[PDB]
Amino acid sequence: TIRSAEHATLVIERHLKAPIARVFRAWSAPEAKRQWFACHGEWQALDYGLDFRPGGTERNYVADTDGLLHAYDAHYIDIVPNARIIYAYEMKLGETRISASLTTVAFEAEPGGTKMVFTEQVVFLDGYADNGARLQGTEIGLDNLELFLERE
Amino acid sequence: TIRSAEHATLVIERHLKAPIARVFRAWSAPEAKRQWFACHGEWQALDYGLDFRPGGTERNYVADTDGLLHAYDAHYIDIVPNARIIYAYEMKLGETRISASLTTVAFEAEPGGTKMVFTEQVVFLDGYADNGARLQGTEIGLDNLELFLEREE
Fold first, then answer.
1. Which residues of chain B approach chain A closer than 8 Å at the C-beta?
2. What CATH number is attached to the domain comprising B104?
3. Cβ separation of A7 and B78 shorter than 8 Å?
4. Which residues does chain A have within 8 Å of residue B78's beta carbon, measured at their own beta carbons?
5. Domain named Activator of Hsp90 ATPase homologue 1/2-like C-terminal: which ranges (chain B) (predicted)?
6. How far apart are CA B137 and CA B26, in angstroms?
7. CB distance A102–B100 less than 8 Å?
8. Using CB atoms within 10 A of its CB, is residue A40 exposed (0-12), middle (13-18) or buried (19+)?
9. What total number of domains does chain A contain?
């Protein structure tokens, strides 16, 4: 197998119409995080776990329409209540690791709601062609977060 | 107090006059890595350990002459023998986390040695000012790696 690595930094800024503590709870509470992050559609998360603390972990394993395992695992490094979450994570398709990332999620109250900046520093492995999927997936994820906050 | 985050990506390319398996072995063997990575001389070595596997942990704690703890903790993610190491790590000064990083170390054989590319994607926290510390500290490490490899023969 030919080994290679491609690095990138992705940044997404969102302005949510919700108070900062409520936005943060959407990340800290397993029931909430599962709902918006792991349940992407009429298809519920079948295999989700969260231990939300520095030194903690998160897991979401999903079989796609074609039976391919998308295995997400994260390890929490820094958590400042209502202000910041930093975690490293990896994605595997089947048993093949396609990427590793350091994600920073920063939150701050602003007039009208919350400003959130999501930064992902990622490395894609061994010829896996991202082709913008990571940024698109993340944008849609945060769209779902916003929908979740509205439904509340 | 004032929360902030500053992101950067540092890239270092070092060439070593040692073959790839031997260079890689200096990273994979705890007793080898301790010799080049866990020393300072004037500082107090407090603890070093390495569990070199995906999901494994590494620590390196040292205290400066002011009694200030410099704490390195790493979590390994991807390991391809003689080719690649990826780990995430954090640094603390005392009880204060100053950074978190994703580090990729790529190894490639070339005529008469090994090409190493060390990419660190880092976030500095809460007003901590790097100003060359990270790159310089990493190079010191690699200097010592190089010397370690020369001492082996």
1. 3, 5, 7, 9, 75, 77-78, 80, 83-84, 86, 88, 90, 97, 100-102, 104, 106, 119, 121, 123, 125
2. 3.30.530.20
3. no
4. 90, 97, 100, 125
5. 17-145
6. 18
7. yes
8. middle
9. 1
